[PDB]
Amino acid sequence: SLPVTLSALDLGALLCSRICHDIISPIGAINNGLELLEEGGADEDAMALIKSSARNASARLQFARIAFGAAGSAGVQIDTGDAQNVATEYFRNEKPEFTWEGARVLLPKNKVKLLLNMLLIGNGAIPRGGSLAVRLEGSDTDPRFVITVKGRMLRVPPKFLELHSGAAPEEPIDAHSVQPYYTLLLAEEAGMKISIHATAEDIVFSAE
Amino acid sequence: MSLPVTLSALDLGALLCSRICHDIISPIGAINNGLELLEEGGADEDAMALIKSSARNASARLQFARIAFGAAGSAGVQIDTGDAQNVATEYFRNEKPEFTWEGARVLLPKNKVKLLLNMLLIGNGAIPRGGSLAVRLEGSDTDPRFVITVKGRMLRVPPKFLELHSGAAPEEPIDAHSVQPYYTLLLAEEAGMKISIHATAEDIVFSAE
Amino acid sequence: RGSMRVLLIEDDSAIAQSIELMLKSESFNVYTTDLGEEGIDLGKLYDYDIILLDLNLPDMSGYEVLRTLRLSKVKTPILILSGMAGIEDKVRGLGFGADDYMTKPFHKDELIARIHAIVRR
Amino acid sequence: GSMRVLLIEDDSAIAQSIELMLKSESFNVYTTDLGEEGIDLGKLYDYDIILLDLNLPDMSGYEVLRTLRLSKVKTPILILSGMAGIEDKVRGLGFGADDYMTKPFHKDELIARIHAIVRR
Ligand SMILES: [Ca+2]
Ligand SMILES: [Ca+2]
Ligand SMILES: [Ca+2]
Ligand SMILES: [Cl-]
Ligand SMILES: [Mg+2]
Ligand code: NA
């Protein structure tokens, strides 16, 4: 169970800090690219930066709409096919090879918010790249989520391991560690436990 | 406490994020629609004007959100009102009304500045069809007071803020639309300040101290 | 011109510029109403090939306008454009089809194709 | 004899942004996306300035900083953050950074701070 509890003012402020940070990066890169065109010399290089950053701003906005922004009762259900679409588009410009396996089902919103948030933990697990494989098991009424990571560098993101294990962090939560915290908080609210198993070849994050 | 309903941390977080996303949907979309026009050709200076303005809009909204909604560190942390003035000014170069700031670049506790930036949002909401919005910073560093004054052809307190401020039980569930007035009032409570509404037929004055 | 005639009903003037340009760049003749500026002249609706309703601002209640249009049995087909959460349910509840609605953002190709699909049916 | 810049950055949209901007002013830019390589390149070669992100995968930006100074690298280090806050700047100054910037920034600002810091 979670070793620290963030007030509503704190969770809200940190979550927004995190979204702004992640979407500002491509948006800022876009403006930089536009500034380079009001000069000259790098016109084809600038345009390519503008185009990919725009595609990425959009992918990050779509992902955040569901992973952070979705709201309403557990009756507002979400289709994992929609999760797979925003996830696949998010991961185009991320480092790992991203694959998705499992039949489309409708789950309560908090379960799919969990799922997308675990992908971020997964992405942090293999910071120099590798593969991130999603597998949806079970039924719509008790699903199991399996995120399997492989890569040359391979870890559990330290703040995530710390919070998952019940130890109260030396450092205070910030817009970085808020996402692992948020992930654990979603899992409690959704009635699922996250598990972390390591082998020689991979790490498996699972929830059920 | 005087707020008619209380959101959980999970809800306040989800809805604030939802509001940030709603406010950048159209500028992100337009950048991508402009790029699409560009590639098929024919409207090249229009598509590029659209991309430039949309990209500037997105940046300005994200930067305003980063301070108005965002974290800024630990409990004792202060924010420069000078910074607030810059992100507020840039935000408003994109909005209907005309924007002015009267006040001395001072250091205030963070929630008092977040309060302040959130009152600009309410103020903007109060004049749907444009007009003027004027900020005035008064008081000491220990007892500051914000004055937001709006004038324009239509003039109503934004109904969800009216509802929550007067202590009414909300007619509708708090959502991404009403979360920002909820948040404005939540900040006021935490910062030990209170907001007043002075409505007349010429202007509305939103103030807190 | 002999090309398509479009009424674009907007609840926010600045948000619509993006959409005007996409429609115009296809050589559409585009007419606009700003709900924060003037009501809708319901006398002129049989004069357009299609009506676009663009909803973004909930305090503008442009959804109410859509109701009035529906209950009045306007014959010109209506395409609703929104990025708003919650609106898709309210709009399908009025009896609108799946192709009568489009979530934002969307590709220019998608808008233009859906418009042609609605008019030629 | 152009200006040499070590860029230690992971968010590839920012890196490409900084590369394009700097290279358009004839700077040489050597970028890495891992802090532990940053510590090695900064310990071993000569740069006019090191642009350093706080947000790095294999360690904190601050560890890169603190290790470079503990190893007595005198190369001036400009820190970049996507995460605003006065507290971050001051901690940076405490660890031996020359200056601090938040994303996004314009080309003009980055170039102006680089000259100011380096003095050429
Ligand atoms: Ca990939
Ligand atoms: Ca203005
Ligand atoms: Ca050296
Ligand atoms: Cl509002
Ligand atoms: Mg509109
Ligand atoms: Na990665």
PDB file of C-alpha atoms in Angstrom, chain A:
ATOM      1  CA  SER A   1       0.000   0.000   0.000  1.00  0.00           C
ATOM      2  CA  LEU A   2       1.135   3.557  -0.815  1.00  0.00           C
ATOM      3  CA  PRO A   3       3.705   4.997   1.701  1.00  0.00           C
ATOM      4  CA  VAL A   4       2.785   8.644   0.967  1.00  0.00           C
ATOM      5  CA  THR A   5      -0.559  10.268   0.169  1.00  0.00           C
ATOM      6  CA  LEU A   6      -0.636  13.374  -2.030  1.00  0.00           C
ATOM      7  CA  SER A   7      -3.282  15.997  -1.355  1.00  0.00           C
ATOM      8  CA  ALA A   8      -5.650  16.833  -4.246  1.00  0.00           C
ATOM      9  CA  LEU A   9      -3.842  20.174  -4.729  1.00  0.00           C
ATOM     10  CA  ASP A  10      -0.517  18.345  -5.042  1.00  0.00           C
ATOM     11  CA  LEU A  11      -1.564  15.473  -7.299  1.00  0.00           C
ATOM     12  CA  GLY A  12      -3.411  17.885  -9.556  1.00  0.00           C
ATOM     13  CA  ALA A  13      -0.550  20.341  -9.785  1.00  0.00           C
ATOM     14  CA  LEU A  14       2.072  17.632 -10.390  1.00  0.00           C
ATOM     15  CA  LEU A  15      -0.020  15.805 -13.056  1.00  0.00           C
ATOM     16  CA  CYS A  16      -0.474  19.074 -14.998  1.00  0.00           C
ATOM     17  CA  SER A  17       3.213  19.873 -14.607  1.00  0.00           C
ATOM     18  CA  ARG A  18       3.945  16.529 -16.184  1.00  0.00           C
ATOM     19  CA  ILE A  19       1.520  16.929 -19.130  1.00  0.00           C
ATOM     20  CA  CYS A  20       2.760  20.443 -19.861  1.00  0.00           C
ATOM     21  CA  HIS A  21       6.364  19.265 -19.801  1.00  0.00           C
ATOM     22  CA  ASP A  22       5.711  16.367 -22.193  1.00  0.00           C
ATOM     23  CA  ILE A  23       3.686  18.367 -24.714  1.00  0.00           C
ATOM     24  CA  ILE A  24       5.769  21.593 -24.536  1.00  0.00           C
ATOM     25  CA  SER A  25       8.831  19.705 -25.928  1.00  0.00           C
ATOM     26  CA  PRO A  26       7.472  19.113 -29.447  1.00  0.00           C
ATOM     27  CA  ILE A  27       5.531  22.412 -29.378  1.00  0.00           C
ATOM     28  CA  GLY A  28       8.721  24.297 -28.547  1.00  0.00           C
ATOM     29  CA  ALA A  29      10.605  22.388 -31.249  1.00  0.00           C
ATOM     30  CA  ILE A  30       7.896  23.453 -33.728  1.00  0.00           C
ATOM     31  CA  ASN A  31       8.352  27.161 -32.954  1.00  0.00           C
ATOM     32  CA  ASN A  32      12.133  26.770 -33.151  1.00  0.00           C
ATOM     33  CA  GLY A  33      11.648  25.226 -36.592  1.00  0.00           C
ATOM     34  CA  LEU A  34       9.405  28.113 -37.622  1.00  0.00           C
ATOM     35  CA  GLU A  35      11.976  30.635 -36.461  1.00  0.00           C
ATOM     36  CA  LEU A  36      14.613  28.904 -38.624  1.00  0.00           C
ATOM     37  CA  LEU A  37      12.412  29.425 -41.703  1.00  0.00           C
ATOM     38  CA  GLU A  38      12.105  33.173 -41.118  1.00  0.00           C
ATOM     39  CA  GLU A  39      15.897  33.145 -41.630  1.00  0.00           C
ATOM     40  CA  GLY A  40      17.082  30.659 -44.245  1.00  0.00           C
ATOM     41  CA  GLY A  41      19.623  27.931 -44.864  1.00  0.00           C
ATOM     42  CA  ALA A  42      18.052  24.982 -43.105  1.00  0.00           C
ATOM     43  CA  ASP A  43      14.658  24.997 -44.823  1.00  0.00           C
ATOM     44  CA  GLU A  44      14.380  21.233 -45.543  1.00  0.00           C
ATOM     45  CA  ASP A  45      15.851  20.300 -42.141  1.00  0.00           C
ATOM     46  CA  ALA A  46      13.575  22.761 -40.302  1.00  0.00           C
ATOM     47  CA  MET A  47      10.456  21.531 -42.059  1.00  0.00           C
ATOM     48  CA  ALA A  48      11.224  17.904 -41.120  1.00  0.00           C
ATOM     49  CA  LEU A  49      11.511  18.982 -37.521  1.00  0.00           C
ATOM     50  CA  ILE A  50       8.210  20.863 -37.695  1.00  0.00           C
ATOM     51  CA  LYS A  51       6.448  17.886 -39.304  1.00  0.00           C
ATOM     52  CA  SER A  52       7.602  15.189 -36.888  1.00  0.00           C
ATOM     53  CA  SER A  53       7.137  17.412 -33.865  1.00  0.00           C
ATOM     54  CA  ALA A  54       3.584  18.230 -34.936  1.00  0.00           C
ATOM     55  CA  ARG A  55       2.825  14.536 -35.398  1.00  0.00           C
ATOM     56  CA  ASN A  56       4.277  13.897 -31.954  1.00  0.00           C
ATOM     57  CA  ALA A  57       2.540  16.778 -30.137  1.00  0.00           C
ATOM     58  CA  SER A  58      -0.693  15.318 -31.449  1.00  0.00           C
ATOM     59  CA  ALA A  59       0.223  11.737 -30.395  1.00  0.00           C
ATOM     60  CA  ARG A  60       1.122  12.936 -26.897  1.00  0.00           C
ATOM     61  CA  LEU A  61      -2.096  14.948 -26.606  1.00  0.00           C
ATOM     62  CA  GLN A  62      -4.191  11.911 -27.637  1.00  0.00           C
ATOM     63  CA  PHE A  63      -2.395   9.597 -25.218  1.00  0.00           C
ATOM     64  CA  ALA A  64      -2.758  12.067 -22.349  1.00  0.00           C
ATOM     65  CA  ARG A  65      -6.491  12.509 -23.071  1.00  0.00           C
ATOM     66  CA  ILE A  66      -7.094   8.927 -21.987  1.00  0.00           C
ATOM     67  CA  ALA A  67      -4.117   8.132 -19.731  1.00  0.00           C
ATOM     68  CA  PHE A  68      -4.455  11.299 -17.628  1.00  0.00           C
ATOM     69  CA  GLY A  69      -7.595  13.099 -18.675  1.00  0.00           C
ATOM     70  CA  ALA A  70     -10.375  10.471 -18.843  1.00  0.00           C
ATOM     71  CA  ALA A  71     -13.169  10.874 -16.383  1.00  0.00           C
ATOM     72  CA  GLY A  72     -16.659   9.779 -15.292  1.00  0.00           C
ATOM     73  CA  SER A  73     -18.094   6.659 -13.645  1.00  0.00           C
ATOM     74  CA  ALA A  74     -16.779   3.116 -14.093  1.00  0.00           C
ATOM     75  CA  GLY A  75     -19.683   2.929 -16.533  1.00  0.00           C
ATOM     76  CA  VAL A  76     -17.872   5.228 -18.944  1.00  0.00           C
ATOM     77  CA  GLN A  77     -16.097   2.287 -20.522  1.00  0.00           C
ATOM     78  CA  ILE A  78     -13.101   2.386 -22.810  1.00  0.00           C
ATOM     79  CA  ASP A  79     -12.295   0.104 -25.711  1.00  0.00           C
ATOM     80  CA  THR A  80      -8.800  -1.403 -25.564  1.00  0.00           C
ATOM     81  CA  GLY A  81      -8.712  -1.005 -29.351  1.00  0.00           C
ATOM     82  CA  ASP A  82      -8.752   2.752 -28.716  1.00  0.00           C
ATOM     83  CA  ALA A  83      -6.012   2.289 -26.073  1.00  0.00           C
ATOM     84  CA  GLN A  84      -3.950   0.316 -28.589  1.00  0.00           C
ATOM     85  CA  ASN A  85      -4.378   3.104 -31.148  1.00  0.00           C
ATOM     86  CA  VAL A  86      -3.222   6.022 -28.970  1.00  0.00           C
ATOM     87  CA  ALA A  87      -0.441   3.803 -27.510  1.00  0.00           C
ATOM     88  CA  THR A  88       0.857   2.668 -30.938  1.00  0.00           C
ATOM     89  CA  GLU A  89       0.890   6.267 -32.174  1.00  0.00           C
ATOM     90  CA  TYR A  90       2.585   7.522 -28.982  1.00  0.00           C
ATOM     91  CA  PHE A  91       5.352   4.954 -29.325  1.00  0.00           C
ATOM     92  CA  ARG A  92       6.235   5.722 -32.948  1.00  0.00           C
ATOM     93  CA  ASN A  93       8.696   8.362 -31.827  1.00  0.00           C
ATOM     94  CA  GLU A  94       9.682   6.514 -28.656  1.00  0.00           C
ATOM     95  CA  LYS A  95      12.729   4.225 -28.630  1.00  0.00           C
ATOM     96  CA  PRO A  96      11.391   0.721 -28.091  1.00  0.00           C
ATOM     97  CA  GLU A  97       9.681  -1.555 -30.617  1.00  0.00           C
ATOM     98  CA  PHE A  98       6.052  -1.554 -29.538  1.00  0.00           C
ATOM     99  CA  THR A  99       3.710  -4.531 -30.041  1.00  0.00           C
ATOM    100  CA  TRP A 100       0.145  -5.177 -28.860  1.00  0.00           C
ATOM    101  CA  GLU A 101      -1.602  -8.539 -28.501  1.00  0.00           C
ATOM    102  CA  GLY A 102      -5.050  -9.343 -27.110  1.00  0.00           C
ATOM    103  CA  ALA A 103      -8.695  -9.240 -28.091  1.00  0.00           C
ATOM    104  CA  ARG A 104     -10.574  -5.919 -27.972  1.00  0.00           C
ATOM    105  CA  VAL A 105     -12.729  -5.567 -24.846  1.00  0.00           C
ATOM    106  CA  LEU A 106     -14.559  -2.794 -23.003  1.00  0.00           C
ATOM    107  CA  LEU A 107     -13.137  -2.090 -19.506  1.00  0.00           C
ATOM    108  CA  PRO A 108     -13.958   0.472 -16.796  1.00  0.00           C
ATOM    109  CA  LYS A 109     -12.024   3.756 -17.466  1.00  0.00           C
ATOM    110  CA  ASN A 110      -9.653   3.330 -14.503  1.00  0.00           C
ATOM    111  CA  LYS A 111      -8.481  -0.033 -15.836  1.00  0.00           C
ATOM    112  CA  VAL A 112      -7.471   1.440 -19.233  1.00  0.00           C
ATOM    113  CA  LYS A 113      -5.886   4.507 -17.573  1.00  0.00           C
ATOM    114  CA  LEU A 114      -3.818   1.994 -15.585  1.00  0.00           C
ATOM    115  CA  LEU A 115      -2.905   0.109 -18.716  1.00  0.00           C
ATOM    116  CA  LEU A 116      -1.610   3.191 -20.539  1.00  0.00           C
ATOM    117  CA  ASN A 117       0.212   4.368 -17.451  1.00  0.00           C
ATOM    118  CA  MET A 118       2.022   1.028 -17.119  1.00  0.00           C
ATOM    119  CA  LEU A 119       3.290   1.567 -20.659  1.00  0.00           C
ATOM    120  CA  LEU A 120       5.089   4.630 -19.359  1.00  0.00           C
ATOM    121  CA  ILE A 121       6.699   2.588 -16.593  1.00  0.00           C
ATOM    122  CA  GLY A 122       7.598   0.052 -19.288  1.00  0.00           C
ATOM    123  CA  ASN A 123       9.129   2.775 -21.467  1.00  0.00           C
ATOM    124  CA  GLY A 124      11.213   3.905 -18.504  1.00  0.00           C
ATOM    125  CA  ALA A 125      12.394   0.373 -17.852  1.00  0.00           C
ATOM    126  CA  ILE A 126      14.354   0.286 -21.108  1.00  0.00           C
ATOM    127  CA  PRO A 127      15.798   3.797 -21.480  1.00  0.00           C
ATOM    128  CA  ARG A 128      18.317   2.839 -24.171  1.00  0.00           C
ATOM    129  CA  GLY A 129      15.645   1.059 -26.161  1.00  0.00           C
ATOM    130  CA  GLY A 130      14.585  -2.494 -26.778  1.00  0.00           C
ATOM    131  CA  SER A 131      11.074  -3.904 -27.101  1.00  0.00           C
ATOM    132  CA  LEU A 132       7.879  -3.295 -25.148  1.00  0.00           C
ATOM    133  CA  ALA A 133       5.218  -5.961 -25.631  1.00  0.00           C
ATOM    134  CA  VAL A 134       1.656  -5.629 -24.370  1.00  0.00           C
ATOM    135  CA  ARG A 135      -0.446  -8.708 -23.798  1.00  0.00           C
ATOM    136  CA  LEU A 136      -4.085  -8.554 -22.675  1.00  0.00           C
ATOM    137  CA  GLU A 137      -5.204 -11.748 -20.942  1.00  0.00           C
ATOM    138  CA  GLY A 138      -8.343 -12.829 -19.086  1.00  0.00           C
ATOM    139  CA  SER A 139     -11.862 -11.594 -19.763  1.00  0.00           C
ATOM    140  CA  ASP A 140     -13.419  -8.154 -19.738  1.00  0.00           C
ATOM    141  CA  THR A 141     -14.536  -8.776 -16.081  1.00  0.00           C
ATOM    142  CA  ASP A 142     -11.203  -9.847 -14.750  1.00  0.00           C
ATOM    143  CA  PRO A 143      -8.419  -8.971 -17.214  1.00  0.00           C
ATOM    144  CA  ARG A 144      -4.685  -9.422 -16.675  1.00  0.00           C
ATOM    145  CA  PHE A 145      -2.243  -6.881 -18.212  1.00  0.00           C
ATOM    146  CA  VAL A 146       1.220  -8.082 -19.147  1.00  0.00           C
ATOM    147  CA  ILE A 147       3.894  -5.601 -20.142  1.00  0.00           C
ATOM    148  CA  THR A 148       7.115  -7.325 -21.139  1.00  0.00           C
ATOM    149  CA  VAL A 149      10.301  -5.288 -21.656  1.00  0.00           C
ATOM    150  CA  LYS A 150      13.648  -6.299 -23.185  1.00  0.00           C
ATOM    151  CA  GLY A 151      16.718  -4.159 -23.910  1.00  0.00           C
ATOM    152  CA  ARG A 152      20.449  -3.531 -23.460  1.00  0.00           C
ATOM    153  CA  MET A 153      19.778  -1.514 -20.334  1.00  0.00           C
ATOM    154  CA  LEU A 154      16.986  -2.928 -18.234  1.00  0.00           C
ATOM    155  CA  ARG A 155      15.602  -1.818 -14.878  1.00  0.00           C
ATOM    156  CA  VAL A 156      12.572  -1.029 -12.841  1.00  0.00           C
ATOM    157  CA  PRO A 157      12.493   2.801 -12.784  1.00  0.00           C
ATOM    158  CA  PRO A 158      13.846   3.410  -9.243  1.00  0.00           C
ATOM    159  CA  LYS A 159      11.060   5.695  -7.951  1.00  0.00           C
ATOM    160  CA  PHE A 160       8.542   3.152  -9.161  1.00  0.00           C
ATOM    161  CA  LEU A 161      10.241   0.281  -7.334  1.00  0.00           C
ATOM    162  CA  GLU A 162      10.535   2.384  -4.206  1.00  0.00           C
ATOM    163  CA  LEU A 163       6.824   3.418  -4.127  1.00  0.00           C
ATOM    164  CA  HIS A 164       5.648  -0.081  -5.139  1.00  0.00           C
ATOM    165  CA  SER A 165       7.523  -1.581  -2.211  1.00  0.00           C
ATOM    166  CA  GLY A 166       6.077   0.560   0.589  1.00  0.00           C
ATOM    167  CA  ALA A 167       9.209   2.614   1.270  1.00  0.00           C
ATOM    168  CA  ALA A 168       8.609   6.366   1.831  1.00  0.00           C
ATOM    169  CA  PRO A 169      10.832   8.216  -0.696  1.00  0.00           C
ATOM    170  CA  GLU A 170      13.823  10.233   0.521  1.00  0.00           C
ATOM    171  CA  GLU A 171      13.036  12.759  -2.239  1.00  0.00           C
ATOM    172  CA  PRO A 172       9.550  14.424  -2.376  1.00  0.00           C
ATOM    173  CA  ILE A 173       7.234  13.565  -5.308  1.00  0.00           C
ATOM    174  CA  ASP A 174       7.716  15.803  -8.329  1.00  0.00           C
ATOM    175  CA  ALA A 175       6.362  16.025 -11.910  1.00  0.00           C
ATOM    176  CA  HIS A 176       8.619  13.057 -12.762  1.00  0.00           C
ATOM    177  CA  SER A 177       7.891  10.644  -9.947  1.00  0.00           C
ATOM    178  CA  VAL A 178       4.213  11.612  -9.957  1.00  0.00           C
ATOM    179  CA  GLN A 179       3.533   9.287 -12.895  1.00  0.00           C
ATOM    180  CA  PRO A 180       4.782   6.116 -11.149  1.00  0.00           C
ATOM    181  CA  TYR A 181       2.790   7.273  -8.053  1.00  0.00           C
ATOM    182  CA  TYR A 182      -0.272   7.931 -10.154  1.00  0.00           C
ATOM    183  CA  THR A 183       0.117   4.465 -11.663  1.00  0.00           C
ATOM    184  CA  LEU A 184      -0.012   2.812  -8.257  1.00  0.00           C
ATOM    185  CA  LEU A 185      -2.898   5.048  -7.221  1.00  0.00           C
ATOM    186  CA  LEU A 186      -4.904   3.996 -10.335  1.00  0.00           C
ATOM    187  CA  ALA A 187      -4.250   0.312  -9.568  1.00  0.00           C
ATOM    188  CA  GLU A 188      -5.607   0.683  -6.020  1.00  0.00           C
ATOM    189  CA  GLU A 189      -8.707   2.506  -7.313  1.00  0.00           C
ATOM    190  CA  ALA A 190      -9.245  -0.181  -9.964  1.00  0.00           C
ATOM    191  CA  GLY A 191      -8.880  -3.180  -7.647  1.00  0.00           C
ATOM    192  CA  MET A 192      -5.752  -4.573  -9.356  1.00  0.00           C
ATOM    193  CA  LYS A 193      -2.286  -5.416  -8.038  1.00  0.00           C
ATOM    194  CA  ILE A 194       0.833  -4.721 -10.002  1.00  0.00           C
ATOM    195  CA  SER A 195       3.532  -7.374  -9.989  1.00  0.00           C
ATOM    196  CA  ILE A 196       7.169  -7.054 -10.979  1.00  0.00           C
ATOM    197  CA  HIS A 197       9.185 -10.129 -12.003  1.00  0.00           C
ATOM    198  CA  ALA A 198      12.729 -10.119 -13.462  1.00  0.00           C
ATOM    199  CA  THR A 199      14.623 -12.782 -15.396  1.00  0.00           C
ATOM    200  CA  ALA A 200      17.890 -12.884 -17.280  1.00  0.00           C
ATOM    201  CA  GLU A 201      16.175 -11.788 -20.492  1.00  0.00           C
ATOM    202  CA  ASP A 202      13.321  -9.458 -19.441  1.00  0.00           C
ATOM    203  CA  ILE A 203      11.185  -7.617 -16.904  1.00  0.00           C
ATOM    204  CA  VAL A 204       7.500  -8.351 -16.640  1.00  0.00           C
ATOM    205  CA  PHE A 205       5.066  -5.812 -15.184  1.00  0.00           C
ATOM    206  CA  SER A 206       1.691  -7.452 -14.726  1.00  0.00           C
ATOM    207  CA  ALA A 207      -1.641  -6.504 -13.149  1.00  0.00           C
ATOM    208  CA  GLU A 208      -4.774  -8.512 -12.364  1.00  0.00           C
TER     209      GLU A 208
END
